[PDB]
Amino acid sequence: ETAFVEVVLFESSPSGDYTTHTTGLTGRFSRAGAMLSAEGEIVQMYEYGWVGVVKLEQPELDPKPCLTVLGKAKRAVQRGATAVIFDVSENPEAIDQLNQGSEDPLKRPVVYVKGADAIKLMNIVNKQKVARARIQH
Amino acid sequence: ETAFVEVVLFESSPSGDYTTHTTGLTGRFSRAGAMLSAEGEIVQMYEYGWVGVVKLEQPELDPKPCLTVLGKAKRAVQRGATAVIFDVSENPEAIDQLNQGSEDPLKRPVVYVKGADAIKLMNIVNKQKVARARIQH
Predict the structure, then answer these.
(1) Which of A126, B15, B61, B137 keeps 20 to 30 A from A10, CA to CA?
(2) Smallest CA–CA distance from B14 into chain A, residue
(3) Which domain holds residue A133?
């Protein structure tokens, strides 16, 4: 169940000597996707190997949306996403909705985050360009 | 100014437990760009945080090409590339033209390889399409 998420900044010194910085957050796996660990370069919402980070907004703003959260999940997997992380803060409904795709469940894991862990995540993304996530269990 | 390049493949297991495979490699940093070290996902020849990896073909095939090497180099950095690795194994003279950019050098490192290090890379990039690069010095 619990999905451990490491976010990893990387940064070089003029020397060549580099330094890497890492941040632990925790969210859950959606039964909508696999129970695998995974990793790639983060992307907020190609070539393969990337991690969608998707902030869900209130559905009041999006009464009937383009794609449902699942659709967005699956859409991501088919653009190469090695995994997908929704921030479900603004809409706790997505959890309930995410977890209705156990029948035809994606082959890449599908994690949501909320509250204090969601806010850590978002702060790192927005402040820095490069960034790779690991997602474990 | 020797570049130590490591290509790194991730491969989860059903358990959550996972495995990393790292293949070291050597190259050269061109004066056309920086003497930093960098990290990012690999792309052979939109995102921020990638390492382009360009094979250069025998320069008869392409007599007057769209872009030069250094024009390629700069296209990738313009499009986010955190570095660029050219494969010059089939076009040795690229080295010469890369290093005439050494009073305009690019923010991101520009690196090349050739011969056996070249193959290793190319071998790994194709056989699996989900690969990560750290580049040193």
Answers:
(1) B15
(2) A36
(3) 1-137
